[PDB]
Amino acid sequence: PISPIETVPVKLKPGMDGPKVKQWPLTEEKIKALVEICTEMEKEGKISKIGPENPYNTPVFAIKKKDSTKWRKLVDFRELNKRTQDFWEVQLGIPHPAGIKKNKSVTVLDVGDAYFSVPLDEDFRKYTAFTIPSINNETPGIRYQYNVLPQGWKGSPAIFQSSMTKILEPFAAQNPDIVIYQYMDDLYVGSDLEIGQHRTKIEELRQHLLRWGLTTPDKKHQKEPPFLWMGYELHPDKWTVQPIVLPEKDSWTVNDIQKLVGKLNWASQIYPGIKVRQLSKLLRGTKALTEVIPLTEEAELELAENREILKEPVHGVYYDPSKDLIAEIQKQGQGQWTYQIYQEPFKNLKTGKYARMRGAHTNDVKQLTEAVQKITTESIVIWGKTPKFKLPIQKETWETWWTEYWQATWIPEWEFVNTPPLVKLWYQLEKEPIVGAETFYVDGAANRETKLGKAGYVTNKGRQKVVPLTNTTNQKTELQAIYLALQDSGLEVNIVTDSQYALGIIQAQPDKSESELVNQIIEQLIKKEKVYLAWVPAHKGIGGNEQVDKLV
């Protein structure tokens, strides 16, 4: 006395109708082979014959794997899939080993059978019709339609998985001491108890699926740990990326260096220290994955570190929600940070890296922050909680920064981890003007058309300077003018600019930029003792801005 699997109401996209895709002429054997398949199926209840009415034919083919004695049919549903509505495929993200509790014992259950107990919406079967050409076009082709989720239909998985969970839902509910992952034709169950009770409860289960007539291959899961899943190696208490070593070549193409970045990137999950900058510095606006571009000595000394840290396999543990969850970040260099999340020293649940947002300006603190955030969510996603951070930045530094930064900013619970290089602020502009320090009115100006400009300054001590510049911009000069005032000045100095732009680049306290100029300005700032930047509105003839010296 079986219980029925409630069907799922399925209809086509609004305003659209079914497939009227022509049937392509086959070959005697295939057409004959299909008849074989097709008959067995309907015998099993999978499909059924249909009359001359149903005008929804979907082209079917026939394939054999490779050097075989068996035939396999193939019904192409591409047409019906682009007309079938939309479903909620709950696969918007696969789990992560890092976030999995260790299981003393883990079973598996093939359900490549149950799948055929899940009925296709009655008012939808008609759309899944196909025709087996008959022999010698001397008869009508045999017409069939599905009574079960087709093996290649858009909504098959979506509905297969739903149906299954609904059946398990009440069992998992009365058996909190187990886990059930529904990955395809396999039903993986895990538990943490005497190897005796386990097997039993597995019976309590096999019995359950039997109330829906769901029959299974006697838990003789031909399988058994270890499992290779979506690139990992799972064991009763450890896991790691599937061995994907770094190739040995001399012919690295745009693709060969592209198929070594993803490997390191994916390897970054557990191998502590993976870097991909100098190898990312070999593919920007390229396209023809054939153009073999040279491996700079920068990317060379990098790929050589990779190969040796990838030799000794490194395993990640499992998540034990009882202990604290901790994360540590380190500044590698060049917008490169690498982190390790763990609960106990060296037993990293997972590890990673962070690549600076390629922005013209940014400092170490803004990055450390972005990483912390990036890590933070990824941890909410995986463990449902925020880790405790260990960071290379003195409390005092961080404070000075968030209390003075123009934007709002925050970092969850953290502690200073003294593991150099440390992150720091390299300089701070005075809030008021400096008494007794020379006052440098600077200014710059280029010529839109000739690209010729001047940069310079004039002060209270009579000191002066105007420099001519070839190939430059009305913004460039404005910066050089500050560069100059910073070069020809004492340890303390008040600078005055009318450059709204130039003020901004320093009100963001960048500690490194792309533009070499901005960098010497920095290098210059760092060298100073006290700097006071002041802005005054341009072209308003303001005592000091009598730098009609640049317009010339």
Add this chain to the structure above:
Amino acid sequence: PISPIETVPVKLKPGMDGPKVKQWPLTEEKIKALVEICTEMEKEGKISKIGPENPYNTPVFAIKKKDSTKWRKLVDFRELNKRTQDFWEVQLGIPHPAGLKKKKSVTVLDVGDAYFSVPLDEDFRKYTAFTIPSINNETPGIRYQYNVLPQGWKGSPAIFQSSMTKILEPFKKQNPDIVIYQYMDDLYVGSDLEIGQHRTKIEELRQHLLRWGLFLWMGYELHPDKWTVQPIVLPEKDSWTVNDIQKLVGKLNWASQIYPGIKVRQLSKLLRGTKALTEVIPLTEEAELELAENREILKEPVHGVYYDPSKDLIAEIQKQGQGQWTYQIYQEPFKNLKTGKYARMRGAHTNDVKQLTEAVQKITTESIVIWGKTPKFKLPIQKETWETWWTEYWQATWIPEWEFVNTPPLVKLWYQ
């Protein structure tokens, strides 16, 4: 007890599908409270599970209220609210009470519950699809659908406006000098009484809302008199430095683009020539007058500043340090309709984002009280940092729209 046997004929807008919004991760504890909550909600048929044939989805997370530490379910119906608010006529939002913003005090009541006793258009329920995520995605989400009127839906207040008008008549006809507004699951009640005699008429509004149907013991206190476009102000010093004058001139230059008659000629004439920043400059005759005449222009109100019910309100916030923040609601550049300064309620509160978030809320609450429609904010934070933490400090049952300003406004201190 109360509930309607009929469901208002609802539909989306033409050529607009439903809200297929991704769900963002939630922390365990929030997930647990959402699971419990969504249970009683099912054992009361406010919601019921759905299958794979429902592609639509809306974000959902948990929060806590003003003072209480009990998990509330908040649903971000923004994406729907725009596509769903296909229209609203003679159930139209509400002729805005231009008198609400004038009462000494104002309380904010929570009538979100009343909604959950009104069926929803069967053919519409599929659009209010939301998911309680799973930690790590170990198990599939727990999807649900709405049968009753969804809190936060900008439709529920409209649909219920019928039943609502009456639950108040005996009260409104009684105290006609009082104005009552309704935005979302919020009931805004303002009067001109004593803060003590104010609590009064309100306790009467609860003991009344109880029998007609309906945390109904939650209200906030506002004071719409203390809301203006703050004056711009120049210093009053007896001794001016080149820097002081340089800044003064800088600020007047900026304010000149808001007020016409602003002259700076004379002030900077006393700057001419490379003087040191820390040197004292005396004021001249021309100067002293020019400054004075400039203040005068500044004491008046800016001119031509009008609201345009159609257009949307921009809102800028600037972090000023020491827990001080400044803001300005406007629609056209240099035409603030309102400007303020949010203060320090929690002393040395080492959290900028919690502050920012309370700021955005108050600013929004005000915007509803004035023009009956929330503003679009320009937040001084990185999209990354903001999305990770706001929900952890949010408490309003509504949500404004927002973008991120990642370029330091020179203005920061002028509005200081």
